[PDB]
Nucleic acid binder design. Structure first.
Ligand code: NA
Ligand code: NA
Length: 327
DNA sequence: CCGACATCGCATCAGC
DNA sequence: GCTGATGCGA
DNA sequence: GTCGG
């Protein structure tokens, strides 16, 4: 499927999706439009009518009428009006600032704050997260070429091993699946001293070292198991400096680590196709564990896992290389 | 007709 | 001071 | 908004 097949429609649905999330605060309508947008984007035919599209799972009556109006006229009245609307368009835009959700955005617009410049005029009303999001608004909406990711990975794996050679670190996300670009860097971290039935300084030590060598620049949130922050590759010689990037680091217990690796590697569609197939065999798989369903649906104790493949084994399916986990 | 639609770590607010 | 709810991103 | 109990 190409973009210009049904791109006018998927852009329409995606636009409608954002206004539901950010302005109407209806998260379930948000995913409804996105699910419809996805299944249409995978549809290998140019859609002739709403009735044709309605045959797809996730496409109901209301969207069918909208596709008709778009197909027949080239636009959607409801969408045209909400675009022109000063309140709604401003509320929607502000949510693109990381740290500002639907709730904070509506508050700002309620008291006159509508633009990036308005935000810059009123920084004492922003929390720490929002300021970082404001500071790197442009940088956060850029994607990361795989070449820069590989360089980013080099630093992380190096500094992690430098703190303690027994750490195990894995950069997951679409990067691990071989993608040419990424939205952020997701790092998964474990250590033989950290199990389920188990120091709560393991994560701090790694974060601080990446701060010492000036890879990590800012902090959005940091706890005993999860870090969310900002990082930046060093500038080359006389070259232009790199954009600031989003990076996450999770500390996961050893016995839940490979369930964690598998889950955050994805993709989302793969994980459900895999979850579905998993239950047919009588197993339940989440981010943390793989558990055996009883005769009545009760969960047995979490099964031993020492690799990604161990999980694939449990449910009678051959190991899949990350590059072939798009679905 | 009507509930499900995934769930959780961290920051910060609402309330005691 | 604390506990729980909520917002946010994922 | 869509699906299904
Ligand atoms: Na349908
Ligand atoms: Na945001």
């Amino acid at each position: 499927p190409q973009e210009t097949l049904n791109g006018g429609i998927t852009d329409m649905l995606t636009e409608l999706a954002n206004f539901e999330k950010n302005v109407s605060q209806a998260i379930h309508k948000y995913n409804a439009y996105r699910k419809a947008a996805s299944v249409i984007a995978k549809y290998p035919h140019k859609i002739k009518s709403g009735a044709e599209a309605k045959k797809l799972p996730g496409v109901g009556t209301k969207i069918a009428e909208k596709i008709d109006e778009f197909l027949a006229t080239g636009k959607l009245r409801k969408l045209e009006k909400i675009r022109q609307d000063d309140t709604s368009s401003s509320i929607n835009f502000l949510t693109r600032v990381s740290g500002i959700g639907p709730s904070a955005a509506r508050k700002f617009v309620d008291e006159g704050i509508k633009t990036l410049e308005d935000l810059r005029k009123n920084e004492d009303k922003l929390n720490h997260h929002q300021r970082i999001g404001l500071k790197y608004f442009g940088d956060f909406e850029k994607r990361i070429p795989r070449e820069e990711m590989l360089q980013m990975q080099d630093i992380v794996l190096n500094e992690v091993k430098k703190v303690d050679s027994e750490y195990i670190a894995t950069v997951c996300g679409s990067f691990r699946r071989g993608a040419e670009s990424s939205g952020d860097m997701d790092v998964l971290l474990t250590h033989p001293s950290f199990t389920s039935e188990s120091q709560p300084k393991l994560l701090h030590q790694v974060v601080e070292q990446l701060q010492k060598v000036h890879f990590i620049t800012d902090t959005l949130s940091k706890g005993e198991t999860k870090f969310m922050g900002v990082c930046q590759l060093p500038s080359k010689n006389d070259e232009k400096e790199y954009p600031h990037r989003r990076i996450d680091i999770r500390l996961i217990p050893k016995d839940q680590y490979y369930c964690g690796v598998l889950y955050f590697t994805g993709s989302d569609i793969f994980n459900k196709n895999m979850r579905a197939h998993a239950l047919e065999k009588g197993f339940t798989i989440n981010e943390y564990t793989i558990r055996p369903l009883g005769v009545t649906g009760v969960a047995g104790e979490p099964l031993p896992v020492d690799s990604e493949k161990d999980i694939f084994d449990y449910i009678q399916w051959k190991y899949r290389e990350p590059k072939d986990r798009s679905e």
